[PDB]
Amino acid sequence: KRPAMIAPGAATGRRKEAIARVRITPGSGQWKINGRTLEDYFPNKVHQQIVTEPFATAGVEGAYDVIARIGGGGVTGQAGALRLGIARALNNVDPEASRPALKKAGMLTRDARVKERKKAGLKKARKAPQYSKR
Amino acid sequence: NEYLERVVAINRVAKVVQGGRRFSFTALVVVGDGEGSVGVGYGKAKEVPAAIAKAVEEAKKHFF
Amino acid sequence: GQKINPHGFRLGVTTDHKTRWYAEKQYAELVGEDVKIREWLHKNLERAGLSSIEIERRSERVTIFLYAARPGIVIGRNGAEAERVRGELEKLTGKQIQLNILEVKSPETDAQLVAQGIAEQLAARVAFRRAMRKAQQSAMNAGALGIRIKCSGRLGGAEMSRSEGYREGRVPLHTLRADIDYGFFEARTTFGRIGVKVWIYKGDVTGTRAERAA
Amino acid sequence: ARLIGVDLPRDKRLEVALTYIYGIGRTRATETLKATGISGDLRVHELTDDQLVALRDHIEANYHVEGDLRREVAADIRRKIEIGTYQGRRHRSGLPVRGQRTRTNARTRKGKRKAVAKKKAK
Amino acid sequence: AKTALKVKAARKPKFGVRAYTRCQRCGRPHSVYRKFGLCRICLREMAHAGQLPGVTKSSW
Amino acid sequence: KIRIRLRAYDHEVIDSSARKIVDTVTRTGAKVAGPVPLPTEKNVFCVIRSPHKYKDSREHFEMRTHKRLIDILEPTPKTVDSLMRLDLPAGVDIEIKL
Amino acid sequence: PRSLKKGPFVDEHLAKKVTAQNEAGTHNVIKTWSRRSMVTPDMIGHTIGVHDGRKHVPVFVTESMVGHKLGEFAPTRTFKGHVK
Amino acid sequence: PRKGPAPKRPVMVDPVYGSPLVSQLVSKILLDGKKTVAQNIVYTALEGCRAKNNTDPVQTLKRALDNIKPSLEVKSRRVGGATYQVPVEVKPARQTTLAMRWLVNFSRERREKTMAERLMNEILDASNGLGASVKRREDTHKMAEANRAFAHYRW
RNA sequence: GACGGGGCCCCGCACAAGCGGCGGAGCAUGCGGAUUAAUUCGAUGCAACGCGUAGAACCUUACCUGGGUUUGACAUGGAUCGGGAGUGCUCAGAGAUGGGUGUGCCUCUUGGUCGGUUCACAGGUGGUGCAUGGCUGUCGUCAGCUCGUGUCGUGAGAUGUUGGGUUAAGUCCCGCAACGAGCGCAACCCUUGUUCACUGUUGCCAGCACGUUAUGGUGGGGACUCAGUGGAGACCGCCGGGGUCAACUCGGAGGAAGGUGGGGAUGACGUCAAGUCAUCAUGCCCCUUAUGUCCAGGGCUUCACGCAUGCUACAAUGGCUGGUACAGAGAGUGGCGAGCCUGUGAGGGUGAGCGAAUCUCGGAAAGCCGGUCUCAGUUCGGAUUGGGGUCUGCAACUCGACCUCAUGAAGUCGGAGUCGCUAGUAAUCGCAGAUCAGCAACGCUGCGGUGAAUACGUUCCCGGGGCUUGU
Ligand SMILES: CON(C)Cc1ccc(O)c2c1C[C@H]1C[C@H]3[C@H](N(C)C)C(O)=C(C(N)=O)C(=O)[C@@]3(O)C(O)=C1C2=O
Ligand SMILES: [Mg+2]
Ligand SMILES: [Mg+2]
Ligand SMILES: [Mg+2]
Ligand SMILES: [Mg+2]
Ligand SMILES: [Mg+2]
Ligand SMILES: [Mg+2]
Ligand SMILES: [Mg+2]
Ligand SMILES: [Mg+2]
Ligand SMILES: [Mg+2]
Ligand SMILES: [Mg+2]
Ligand SMILES: [Mg+2]
Ligand SMILES: [Mg+2]
Ligand SMILES: [Zn+2]
C-alpha cells in the first residue's frame, strides 16, 4: 500500500547471453546505457517498453534515474537482461512493497531459454535433412 | 562313484523369438545305487553339462 | 556393434589416461614415439603378459611403467633382459628411458590379463566353453562383483562365426561411477583369429579421481 | 536512335539508360557521367542536344560499343574456333568452355533437356 | 596403406608442394589431423584407450 | 614480478602444483599473488564413428588445456633456486618469466 | 592465369630443344610431354608432338598459337557422341 | 498430441496501441523473423487507417476482424467410402486466428505496390464489409450452410 | 513366435492444427546410365546417393598409355668382398635413371655403416565382408530381454514378466505360485539457468590520485562483470484436494528454476549372412623380370540423359547507396598480421605485435536511420560468354580460387507427388573451425543475432508397445 521507497541500489541482469550491470539511483528518471541515452542505445520503441515497465509495475515511476552497462547478446537480449537487472535492483531495494507485484508480473525470473546447440546429422539444432525414401 | 548313472537321452529344444530361435538342451539321467534304489531326473539348461547336473540332482530326491 | 569402449566412456570421470605429458609443438611426434614404444613392447613381450604401458615425460626423458603379470620374462636373469629392452628403447626413440616394471596384484581380476589367458587357451585349442567358465570362476573366486566374457569368431574351428558369451554377477556398463575394467585380445588360430572381450566389475568408485586413486 | 545505335528509354534515369547501351555497364555509365559532368539522376527526356552529343563523343572516343564490340567478340570466338584450342572445340560443340561440369546440368549451354529413352529394367 | 606409398610419403618429395600427411600409425591418407598425426579411426580408438593426454569425449 | 605459468590437462594436478609452488615460495618468505585461473583452451575434434559410409553418427572429443598464473612479488634469490630445483608432476609444465 | 611478373612458363627443355632446332634448321618434329608449357614466338613455325595421355599428337604452331598452352591443342578425352 | 492440450504462450500487448490484437497482427505478418520490419508495416498501415478515417485504427482493425471472423467451418470426415464436409462451430480464439490469417494472406495477395498499405487498404475494406477476406468468410459460411446436414456427426 | 484389410489399451512431427520448403529454373555436389585407353574402388528401399573423401592440377592414386626396374620402393637375418656411406656442382633424359666431378667413416686389428653376389625373403588398395576379428549402421531412446530357485504340465513350455492403478519408462503401487536377481529405464558424468566462498592477470572499474585532448593508460581497488576451482540449490521437500489408500495426480506458496527445468554423452538380449578384406588385422586362394615397384603424361572433372542433396533466385517484408548500433564460439610462428604507402580492386611493397583473456584474424550480418529505384523480365536474377589481371604452386590446357571490364540466359513461386519442425524450435542472418600451398566449401561440424504460427484431437496414414483372439 505504501508508495515503496526511492533509495539507491544496484543489481545484475542476464538474458540470452547478455549481461546487464544496473545501478538505480534517485533522480529525474533519465537514462544512460553505455554512455549513450535510452533513445540512442534502444533507438526504437520496439523494446523500450520491456525495460521501462519494471518502473511502471513498481510504485516508483519515471522520476528515478538508472545507469546501465550492457555487454554481449543482441538488442532484444540486452533489453531483457536490462529489464531483469532493473527488476532485481528494485527487488533488493524494497523487498516488501515492490516484491509481490514485481515477482507476480514474472519479472524476478531469468528465462534460461538459450540457443540450442547444433547436432550431428542435422542441419540445425532440430531441423533435419530432407528425408528421401528411394 | 558312489551312485551309478546313465544318460538316457539328450535333446536340442528351441524357442522361437523375434530375433530367431533360443536353443536349449534337455537331459534324461537315471541314477541308482545298484542294489534297489533308483530314480530318474529331467534337466533343462542352455548347456549339456548344466542340464545333466540339474537332472541328476533332481533325480537324487526321487529314489524309490 | 553399438557399444562404447568402457574405458573411453569412463575416461576423465573415473579412470585416467595412460600417458601423462604436456607438449604443444611436438605433440604429434611424441604421440608417434609413444605408438612405436607400445607396438614394440606388445610385439616383443607377449610372454610376460602386458596389462598396461604407462608413459610419462619430463624433459626429453621418457618413463615407462610396464604393468605385467609375470615380470620374470621382462627382467630375465639379474636384470639382463630389462637392460636389453631398455637399450632397444633408446635405440628406437633416441631419448633417456627410465623403465620400471610393476606387478598386478590380482591377475585373475585384471580383465586384460584374463583376455590374454583366454586367447592363449583358444590358440592352444582348448574348448572355449571350458576356458570361459574357468576364467569366470577364477574371477569370482578372487572376488570381482561381476564377470562378462564374450568370444566371437570361428569358435571351435567351425565355418560359421559365433558370439558365445558368459556372465554372472552384475556388470552395469551404463553406470559411470561403476568401476569396470575392460580387456580385449585376439587368439591367433589356424582359423583366423578369435576376439575375446572381458568386462570385470571391480566395484563402485566415488570421485576426486576415484578417491584420488583410492 | 538516341545514342550510337540504341534509343534511350524515356522516363528512366540517365545512369541506367546509359547501361542500356551494349558495352556499357553500371560502373562504365557512372564513369561516363563523371567525365561528361552530367547529372545521372535526371530523366532522359530532359536532355539538351549539346550535352547528349558530348556524352556520345565521350562514349565513342573511350569505349568500344554496340556493333564494334559485338563484332570484336564474334571475331574472338571465331578465332578460337579456327585455332582449335580446347575452348574453341567446346565452342564448336556448344558446350561449356570454362571447365564447368557437364555430367549433371550444363543447361544454359546444352539448351532444354531433350530426354532420351534408356534401357528398361525387368 | 601400401608400404611403398608409406615410405614414399615419409621421404622428401622433391618439390615441396608434393608432400602429404599419412596416418603416422596407420598409413591412412584421408582425414589426418595435424595436431597429433594419426587419422580418424586411429584418433578414435587411441582416445578411447587413453593414450592421448587431454583428449576426452565431449558432450557439452 | 617473476611470472609462473602453469599449463596441464587436469585441473586437479594444476591446482596441486599451484598450491605446491605457492607454499614453497612462502616457506621461503616471498609473498606471492594468488593463483589466478586463465581461460581454458578448448579444442574440439569431430570424427566419423564408423570406418566406412556412416557419416550421420559421429564422436566428439576435446583437449582442454588448463592454465594458472602466479606472480612472485618478492625477488628472493633463495626462492629462485627453490623454484628452479623443485620437482613437478609430468602432466603439468612450468614457464618461468624472470 | 600465371602472374605476369613471373613471366611465361616454358618447361626449360622444350625451350632448349626449340632453340637447338632454330640453330640447326627449323625442320623436325619435337616430341614432348610438356602440355604444361607456354607457346612462345621463338618456336613459331615448328611442329611439336604434344602428349595427350597415350600418343604424341603433332601440332604445327602458327602465329596465333602464342597466347596458349601446348596442351590446349592435344585433347585428352574422346567422346564422338552418345549412341551412334 | 496424444498426451494432452499443449500450453499456450501468453499474448503480449502492443506498446503503442495497447491492444493484444495489434501484437497478434504483427506476429502474423512477421515474415522471416523480422519483428521490426513486420511492425513497421503494421504501424504504417494503422496510421494510414487513422489518416483516411478519423476513427481509431485499433477500433477499425477490430471491426475488420469481426467482419472476417467465421462462425462455423467444415472439415473432412472419413465416414464410409466417401469423404464428408462436416460443419463445426469455431471457438473465439480459432476464429480470431482465422480472421487474422485471412487478412494477412489477402493483403499479401492485393495488387497495390507496398505491403504496408496493401494491408491498410484490406483492413479498411474489411471494416466496411468488402474485400477478398470478407468474401472468403462468406464463402466458407455458405459452404457450411450447404453441408449443414452433417451437424449430427460432431463428437 | 511372427503376422492379421481382429479386438481393447497406448506412444512418436505419425496424422491433424500450423510455418517454411523440395518436385519447375540456373548453378554446386553425389550417383545411375552412357562414353572412354582409363573414366580406380567401395556404398544401392527406409538404414546407398554434399556417403568412405575433415580438401583428386603434380602428389593423393589405388586407374590408363608409355618409359624404367627385379632380394626389388621398404623390412629382418646369416654369410662374403669392403671402406665410405651419404651427398655438393655438372651432363644426358619427360622423368625415373644413368654418366661425370668435388668431398670423403668412428673405434680398432676385431664395432657402427654400406656394397654387391646370393641365400633366406620381402611386396600386393590382388580375391573372398557368406571364413573372420575389430569398428559401425539399423529396428530404437524403442520398454524391453532374460536368469537362479520354487511350482504347474508327460513334453516343448509356463509361472515370475498375467491382473487393477500409475509413469517418459518392466517407473512405481495393489493384489498374486511365486520368491529373487541381472542386463535395459532412472541416477552417477558434461553443458546451460540462480547463488556463495576463494583467487585478480593478459580480465573487470564502484570509491581515490593523474593522465597530451585522448585509451583502466596510470597507482590502486575485491564492489560489479568475467575467468575457474570448490560448495549450495529441486527432493512432489512444504500446503490443500483427488487418489481406501498406495504409487501417482491436480492446485498453491516459496524460488533463478516445479514436478524429468533445457540439451548432450550413454544404444539392453538380439535382428538385417546389413557396411567395411580399401583404415587396421587376418583364414584360405591367387601374382612373383609382375597383380611388385619407380616415373612423366593422362584419368578419377567425360555428357543425348535420369535421380538425389543443396545454393542462388524469381523481387518492393525488396534492389542500390551513405551513415550508424548489438555477438558468441573459435584459430594463429613456413602462422595470425595491424599500421603506413601503392593499385579501381584481387593484390603488391614495407612491416610492428603476438606461441597469444594481452597481439592478429575483426568486418559481425540481419536491424535502425537518410537518400534513391517505382512493379518494368526490371536498377529483379547472375547463369553464360569475350577482354584485361592477381595469388598459391616446379606447374593452373585438360582441371584452381579470386579481381576487374563487358555480356545479362532460364526464372512471374513451380505437375502428380513429397520433406522438416512443438520454442529460443521453425524461418532467416552472419561468424569460426577441421582437412588445407591453393581450392571448385553452396559441403561438414559448431557459434551466436533476430525470432514465429499452431497442436480441438486420435477418426484416418506410417512406425512401435502391453494384453488378448485366430492361423
Ligand atoms: C548374390 O550372392 N548370393 C546370391 C547371395 C549372397 C552371397 C554372399 C554375399 O556376401 C551376399 C549375398 C547376397 C547379397 C544381397 C545384397 C543386396 N544389396 C546389395 C542390395 C540386398 O538386397 C540386401 C538388402 N537390401 O538387405 C542384402 O542383404 C545384400 O546387401 C547382401 O548382404 C548380399 C551379400 O553380400
Ligand atoms: Mg597437398
Ligand atoms: Mg500436416
Ligand atoms: Mg530444381
Ligand atoms: Mg564410381
Ligand atoms: Mg574390393
Ligand atoms: Mg553382405
Ligand atoms: Mg557382416
Ligand atoms: Mg557387398
Ligand atoms: Mg541412461
Ligand atoms: Mg589382402
Ligand atoms: Mg569423384
Ligand atoms: Mg517433440
Ligand atoms: Zn590410421
Residue numbers in the entry:
A (entry chain J): 40 to 173
B (entry chain E): 32 to 95
C (entry chain G): 2 to 215
D (entry chain N): 2 to 123
E (entry chain S): 2 to 61
F (entry chain M): 5 to 102
G (entry chain U): 2 to 85
H (entry chain I): 2 to 156
What's the publication's text?
We determined a 2.8-Å resolution structure of the 70S ribosome of Cutibacterium acnes by cryogenic electron microscopy and discovered that sarecycline, a narrow-spectrum antibiotic against Cutibacterium acnes, may inhibit two active sites of this bacterium's ribosome in contrast to the one site detected previously on the model ribosome of Thermus thermophilus. Apart from the canonical binding site at the mRNA decoding center, the second binding site for sarecycline exists at the nascent peptide exit tunnel, reminiscent of the macrolides class of antibiotics. Unlike the ribosome of the Gram-negative bacterium Escherichia coli, Cutibacterium acnes ribosome has two additional proteins, bS22 and bL37, which are also present in the ribosomes of Mycobacterium smegmatis and Mycobacterium tuberculosis. Sarecycline (SAR), a third-generation tetracycline-class antibiotic with narrow-spectrum activity toward some gram-positive bacteria, including C. acnes, was developed for acne treatment.
Using local refinement on the 50S subunit and the head and body domains of the 30S subunit, we generated better quality maps of these regions at resolution 2.9 Å for the 30S head, 2.8 Å for the 30S body, and 2.6 Å for the 50S subunit. SAR binds in the CBS, inhibiting the decoding center. Surprisingly, the nitrogen atom of carboxamide group in ring A of SAR forms a direct hydrogen bond with the backbone phosphate oxygen atom of m2G950 (m2G966) of h31. These interactions stabilize binding of the D-ring side of SAR in the decoding center. In the C. acnes structure, the SAR C7 moiety is oriented toward nucleobase + 6 of the mRNA, which may allow sequence-specific interactions with the mRNA similar to those in T. thermophilus 70S-SAR complex.
